[PDB]
Amino acid sequence: TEWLLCDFHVHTNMSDGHLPLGEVVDLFGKHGVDVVSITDHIVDRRTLEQRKRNGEPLGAITEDKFQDYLKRLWREQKRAWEEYGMILIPGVEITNNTDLYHIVAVDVKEYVDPSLPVEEIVEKLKEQNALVIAAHPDRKWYLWANMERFKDTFDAWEIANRDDLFNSVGVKKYRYVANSDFHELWHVYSWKTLVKSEKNIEAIKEAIRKNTDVAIYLMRK
Amino acid sequence: TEWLLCDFHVHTNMSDGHLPLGEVVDLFGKHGVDVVSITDHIVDRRTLEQRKRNGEPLGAITEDKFQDYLKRLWREQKRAWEEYGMILIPGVEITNNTDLYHIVAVDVKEYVDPSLPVEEIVEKLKEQNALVIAAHPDRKKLSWYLWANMERFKDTFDAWEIANRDDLFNSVGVKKYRYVANSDFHELWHVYSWKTLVKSEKNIEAIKEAIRKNTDVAIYLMRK
Amino acid sequence: TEWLLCDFHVHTNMSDGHLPLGEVVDLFGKHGVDVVSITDHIVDRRTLEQRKRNGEPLGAITEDKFQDYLKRLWREQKRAWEEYGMILIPGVEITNNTDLYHIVAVDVKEYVDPSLPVEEIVEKLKEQNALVIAAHPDRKWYLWANMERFKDTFDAWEIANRDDLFNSVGVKKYRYVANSDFHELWHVYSWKTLVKSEKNIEAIKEAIRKNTDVAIYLMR
Amino acid sequence: TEWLLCDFHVHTNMSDGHLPLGEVVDLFGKHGVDVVSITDHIVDRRTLEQRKRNGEPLGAITEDKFQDYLKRLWREQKRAWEEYGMILIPGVEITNNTDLYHIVAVDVKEYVDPSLPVEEIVEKLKEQNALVIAAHPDRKKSWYLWANMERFKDTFDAWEIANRDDLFNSVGVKKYRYVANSDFHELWHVYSWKTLVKSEKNIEAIKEAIRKNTDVAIYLMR
């Protein structure tokens, strides 16, 4: 166990990020990030159809393309490791804009319908042995309004996002992670998670879940 | 360079803490803290006179007793190391309650008058090779002088408290200032608090260097 | 705020243009351009060494002369202003003909090695508070093959050059500018940039970066 | 003379657009377009007969209804100006799908038969003091106008150098007079290339400016 620099909340142009998968990997890799998870949006059906009909970009991975999406991440795991000794973890941001809950899952293997209740989504992700994070809206909300309700539900809560800290997770002593919520280049510099863990995916998930050796770290230019 | 667990803002019953020094050291050592600074209060003359006048406790080390205070900590350095492999750094909290600024000095050697202007205090502390932290008032707390004037003091402090007890102060992070996180310990239960994790060799000069540079510094919430 | 006529991509005989600096400045001045950047080439070493070897002209400012070049441009800012109320901005075209990227920097202060990676080059230009443009090759290329990758990299992309529009910039809704890529007198008639901005260098760079009040205009 | 943002090529559900007239106006108004022309289709006889015959929608304003169509637009001129300070100009798209020329006319007052020769159409429109633009087929879609550009060099006040999200290099390379429009049918077509023109904010001044074409730029609304 050394301390690893991690970012569990990162988007590409496969959903609504600015940048291609390869480039997001090169950026984080060249900046010494040890562990990154790609968490592109899957979206509730209302939101997706609202976008289709207004001719807006979907900004999401469709259920039909989700397998092809994970396949791209499976392949990038290889490049990320061989080129940077970086651990890339396939994930997803389960994004419900109708009921206003965004849930990040790390080490996902199957699509989960974002329109399902929070507990069913989470039970589904736990059946996949994914890590489950309550994401916090970025500075620029159902989970955060009902934190006591969801106390044993999530493995960790976002205490930090972009350049912002959220005192409510700390005050309640909840389990915490800190991520960039990356969409564009300059978001690479953000609060990150430092975790004391063997450098393998099961170990990393365990360490976040335990949350006894997890700190938050602000990466600056 | 392994990452070390650090708390640079800790008080004992020598100033206004609830607990005896020995007991504070034992508690931090048994909780596996790697670096602790004891930063008991020195307070401006006017505040002292006022407490003296109201017959309330001084809650501070007097100028006359400062070397005796340092002498207790130097002996505590020995025990801290022998019993826990812990680095105790003598420090102080320079407490101006008249003008409302609290400055934590880590690895202090000489008394400095808390009444002086901020930059005079800091220049004095730099001559001693002490690490100089801008302390944040705790949430159980007025408009505080350093925090109202952050841009003015940006090149004055080696670090600002981004966190204190169980609270985070987003202003530090938003501006990307150098940061530390401490307990501001007074009571048993303040041991469980935000702390600083720093990548550094386990020696006092190396630790101060790491904090000043502030590129391998994280914050860490110690829980029961 | 008035809309300004700008040309951010212009060469002189100090690199590979046909004309003297003074004459290029007058030409643009007299045709009523509000903002012009002189962007003479600096070239990667491999390409310089090749030309040296084949006895071909360098067509570039050498690293050693780069300050003397900018010096000439500082002096021309004074004259361009006094004579024509025109804003001349020192610039450069970072020309890598080994890996085929040309990068135009507006309000450049220091030489940047064109042999560096694109991202290193750009981060260096941003450190100088320069405006960074993806030059498109004239109709008579690594960046254009990799536009998605460089989306957050450039402040703007050439959507037009000489008399040619490049549909790919627009189709992608990328930030755009339009310039002459001037080398010859007749290149003064070309696609140019109309930008709504205060008439000052910082304001202009900001308005190109924002790109919300930027149009293209054909000078005939 | 400030620079006005303009769209001279917009359709409503009165021809083959998807949207109510009122909506179209509200959409352009609230996006800060200064000048809009509604240019619904009128269509050559042969095409209309063919459509009637196949039971297809006409997607055109009939000759019988043309004046009612203009009346709908005159009333919207008032609301466009009052609500948004926007100049709405009644126009039309003269649509010959038999010989393949689409001609956009801005500030139209009378119906003109799309089956007439290009040149006779343009003369009829110039007798009405209408601005006359050669419309370029949108990318999604051999066109007569565009195949015979030299023939029509002095025929049109302007050619479409841009349409929806596409640029057509042929107009610029020839250094012809140009405008850029949305060719709007669907809600999302409001984000398109548009024309930026330096002009007094009135319909005669505007038509004059496009015609001169020396203070005309194109502008991508995103």
Place this chain on the structure above:
Amino acid sequence: TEWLLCDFHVHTNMSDGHLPLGEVVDLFGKHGVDVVSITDHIVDRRTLEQRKRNGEPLGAITEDKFQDYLKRLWREQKRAWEEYGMILIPGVEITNNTDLYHIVAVDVKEYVDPSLPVEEIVEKLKEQNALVIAAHPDRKKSWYLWANMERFKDTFDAWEIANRDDLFNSVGVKKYRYVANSDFHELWHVYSWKTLVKSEKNIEAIKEAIRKNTDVAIYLMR
């Protein structure tokens, strides 16, 4: 051409000012100064050696760090304009405490050795297209420039007629070209004499206006 409020003589903690660069900029920005030049000291060799030797602070930017100093100022040009619409101009105070001439240069691009003769300094600065001002010693403080005014009649673009809260009648009585600045080191020095100049809001226009000196006034900010 409206009248711009200007301060061409301001120091930061990078030389001997009390305040961070960012603060200085924020202070002038929020007080509505239109144009500021940061003019930290560069100092003659002999003075620097003397200071090193006495263990005093250098209170200067070294030749080695000059380009980094300018880089700090270029980045602040951007933030000054974006946050305040203020023009920040990189400058310098050429400080010869051996022969006693202080020369302020506005829009500087290269380091110039303060140990050079007055005239050689000014030529080097005019080769950079910098504006060149004779700085007047502040009152709190026999100076070469001021003792030899006739000698330097056509040497400087302007002389300091005012500094902090003091006016120097010698410049006006001679009817020389003038500017008025704060010579800022401490927070309270923002309230000082300043220059009001009728100019287009750009650095070349501004330098030209001061140089002509026919639309330049002095203004006490309180």
